[PDB]
Amino acid sequence: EDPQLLVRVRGGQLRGIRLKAPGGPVSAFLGIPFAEPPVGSRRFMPPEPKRPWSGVLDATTFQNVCYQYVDTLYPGFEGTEMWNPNRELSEDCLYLNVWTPYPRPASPTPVLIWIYGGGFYSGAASLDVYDGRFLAQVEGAVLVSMNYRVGTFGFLALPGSREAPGNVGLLDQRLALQWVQENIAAFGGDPMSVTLFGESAGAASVGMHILSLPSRSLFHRAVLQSGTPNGPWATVSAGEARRRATLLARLVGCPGGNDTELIACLRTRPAQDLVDHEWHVLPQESIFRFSFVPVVDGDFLSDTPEALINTGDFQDLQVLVGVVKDEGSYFLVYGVPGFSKDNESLISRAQFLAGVRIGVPQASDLAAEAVVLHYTDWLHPEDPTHLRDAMSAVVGDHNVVCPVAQLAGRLAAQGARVYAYIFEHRASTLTWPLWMGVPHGYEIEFIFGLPLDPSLNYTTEERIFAQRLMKYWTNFARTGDPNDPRDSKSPQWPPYTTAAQQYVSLNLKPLEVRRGLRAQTCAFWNRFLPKLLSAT
Amino acid sequence: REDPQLLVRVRGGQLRGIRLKAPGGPVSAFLGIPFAEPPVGSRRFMPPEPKRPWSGVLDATTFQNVCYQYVDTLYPGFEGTEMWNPNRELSEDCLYLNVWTPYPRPASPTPVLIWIYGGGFYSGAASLDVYDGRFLAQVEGAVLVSMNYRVGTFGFLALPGSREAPGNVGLLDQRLALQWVQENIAAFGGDPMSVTLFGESAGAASVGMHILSLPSRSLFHRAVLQSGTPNGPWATVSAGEARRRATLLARLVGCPNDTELIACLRTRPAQDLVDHEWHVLPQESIFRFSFVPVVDGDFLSDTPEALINTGDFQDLQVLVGVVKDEGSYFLVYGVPGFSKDNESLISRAQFLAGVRIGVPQASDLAAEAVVLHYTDWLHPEDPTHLRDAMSAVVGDHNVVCPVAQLAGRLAAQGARVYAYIFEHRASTLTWPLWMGVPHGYEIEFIFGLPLDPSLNYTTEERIFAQRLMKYWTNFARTGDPNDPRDSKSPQWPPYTTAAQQYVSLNLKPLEVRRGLRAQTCAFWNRFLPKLLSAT
């Protein structure tokens, strides 16, 4: 019994496991329950705190993955499969993971809390890319990740109901945050220095915690990678949530009438029956749209993210935000005709016009015409390479890049300290084809430091790069500034402001400072298209 | 007892011209030749009638009267405005044309260039110094013809469907001059089977309307449109709008049945009409003119738009182009914040106000779309970017994108098209630097004025002028601006829908570029119409 691996938390004793990191050992405590299993009658309900336990709880292995859709687009393909559940599916899934330096840090260390993505319909903290051992060992950080309910189980809502009030998966996250405040000092973490970071729907989640007051006493800084609370996919109105939940119920045979009766019938259904019809409730043929997501309930979210970002005070907050070079490519293969991992995806103009209706599903005929006309290269209007890359750009700008620029600008104007980046390095080991470039999600492995494990076959320069990023992120966690406090120069990473709009490129070369994140194009999405809606 | 080489007979009778000095030698000039009956009195607003023959020898040694017009008062005494003002007496008796030819006249039939002046269809004269045909005549051996045509109410006031004021009579004045060339230009040594029209601004729009009107098409073979087009927001009005403007003008001068209204307008002093002419525009605007060509179903059988889209132009060669800063000239005539006497650094508020004045038909949404497209979102309040964006707005809307549209529709419908952008700022320009290369400041170079040493242009500008004169006359002669002998010099390739090629005209050798403001002209020519159409 290694005494470094025995910790007492409020709920009882835990036994961790010592893991090998390239530089030395780390202590891992995996599968720690932070909530009562949200099963049976607790389905769709807010999480309750985990009852204390007797003896020593085994925290040496990852717990079950929250019940979710499993991808079938390309069976056997690592590029999709690496995001799929790597443990058994269960509704009994509310557990978290802590990595710490071995031996336990002598003085309180900054804590980084990872929140995974997956369109609020998928994901798990147990995926290999979210492995906290490298950050813990090399940077001396305490790293935490939690499972939170996804799909219908996390986000099905009949707004105003006691039984399915909405946003319970975000309440799962918050409960893990409260757990860290209460318990993390036992692992050597500093609860007065907590930094949330996440990607895609995880980044959106981090932004939802910034915009919800009860969460604000639970962290000090935030990192939003390729995702935002504002924007077209991350939230729904109460009316639309109700409509989707009612349709799903009808599809599985429930009950209509009374919320209580409808929700009671939904609780009788096998979990896979709910997942089988999850996708059939979206109003349009679309991509980058997800059926069950956070809802503007007037509680967790007191108003729309738009309203809350525009009128908030963010003076004692520091934020790091950014995007990858090709945010849209990933999603095109899941719905737009002409696109595939298995060919160069050179498309016709006709296929481009069609793809825009699917990639921008809420667009009117006139707004879709505006998008086609703005993204067409009028010197090469029917060139398939341009049309393919423009399709990627539309989806990426609409859903990620322009939402990020919006948020960055409002936070900075409202008093926040903001740093921005674009991530431009494509992994040498990527299994997706070249045309997809640097796809959504493929920065994470670098930030978590996987290239430091030589068994994985990254290059030497990829390892040096990973180490740079791990430092930016942990420096930001420590101080709210990603710049190294004693290293003279590297050119410095400047704060993003509304006047100068400075951001940096993260690639194999030294930091380069640029001005304006797609400034002209994001004026189209963020300023003009809204007026085109209001006017007509 | 007088110079035998200056005496010539035309259909109407005998003429006596004058021997003028050009720097490389003498030229012959026949100035003030009448081609129509004076459009005065009961003939006001009526189509032109051919000139009745005269007895004896008509003196054609001086320019005739300028067609009655508004005289610019913006900057009194200032050469930049005054050079475009009338330089002879204003009269409604103004339908005269001018011919320049080599001295002695050519022995073999020579290609003819016909100049049609601009000035918004409200102004201009063939007698202005910048339209001096002596250098083209002397240096290129050209026969150059320029006519006066009626402008303003006199040329373009229309009550459509009426007999007495049918509209477009200023265009008919031009047409009659073209008919005169066909009948008479051989007497001067010109080739009536090789006639090239060229003109600038409204003059260019006019050339385009001759292309689109069948009776004119038998009267020339090739065309050059400089900074203007028949299509676009300013060159034509609908029948209904012409009538509305005609009728309001009538009211403002005390003329409340078409025959009666028109009979009453014919009794009014010409100056009374000019004095109220600007009051009939529907909006506070720039680059808009009260009395212009009307879509009458006759001269123009349909809208220039419909005619460029459905025409067969297989037998047409055209040279078209623009200057670097089409919009700047117009800003000082009505956008608050702009002046010749300072740098015109404007605020964002002044930019938004200026967009409404420069795009006066735009709804609020279209105007917002224009502002967002032309804003630099990195420096959205920078007064220098805002000034220059105001300029680009007015220029792209009124000139550059209409020209792009015309060039593409002509090329797709079978025409051979050549396109340019003119980028040299005359060293002698009196407008301030911020105005760049303004609308109209290519003309002096094409006409070869730098060749006159009294004008103080640079040596490099003389050589540039000579190059331009060659492109224009080569095109006139062969329908190709390139010299067939000169191989290694860069070539000017035709404009096509696929490649969109065009050349820069400056002190450097020809540089081929691709796409004439392709992205921005997509906004003006493809999107804004759909925004209108949907709303």
Ligand SMILES: *[C@@H]1O[C@H](COC2O[C@@H](C)[C@@H](O)[C@@H](O)[C@@H]2O)[C@@H](O)[C@H](O)[C@H]1NC(C)=O
């Ligand atoms: C630029 O001039 C505009 C036109 O009015 C004037 O011209 C200038 C040169 C001054 O002499 C003024 O006193 C004249 O009235 C002004 O409207 C504009 O505000 C001027 N620009 C600035 C910011 O000074």
Ligand SMILES: *[C@@H]1O[C@H](CO)[C@@H](O)[C@H](O)[C@H]1NC(C)=O
């Ligand atoms: C690429 O692959 C998919 C399926 O194999 C196919 O549907 C698509 O048409 C292909 N691309 C083209 C347009 O050749």
Ligand SMILES: *[C@@H]1O[C@H](CO)[C@@H](O)[C@H](O)[C@H]1NC(C)=O
């Ligand atoms: C041209 O230059 C001369 C000599 O310096 C000067 O006196 C004359 O006024 C100038 N003329 C013009 C046309 O500006």
Ligand SMILES: *[C@](C)(O)CCC[N+](C)(C)C
């Ligand atoms: C985002 C909307 O959550 C999508 C993220 C998808 N993976 C594959 C990166 C997890």
Ligand SMILES: *[C@](C)(O)CCC[N+](C)(C)C
């Ligand atoms: C055009 C609309 O006719 C304007 C031409 C103006 N000048 C000053 C160049 C003649």
Ligand SMILES: CC(=O)CCC[N+](C)(C)C
């Ligand atoms: C991977 C996605 O973004 C969506 C997958 C869901 N469908 C396969 C039903 C589109």
Ligand SMILES: CC(=O)CCC[N+](C)(C)C
């Ligand atoms: C120079 C022009 O474009 C027209 C000016 C006419 N007003 C001075 C009456 C506005």
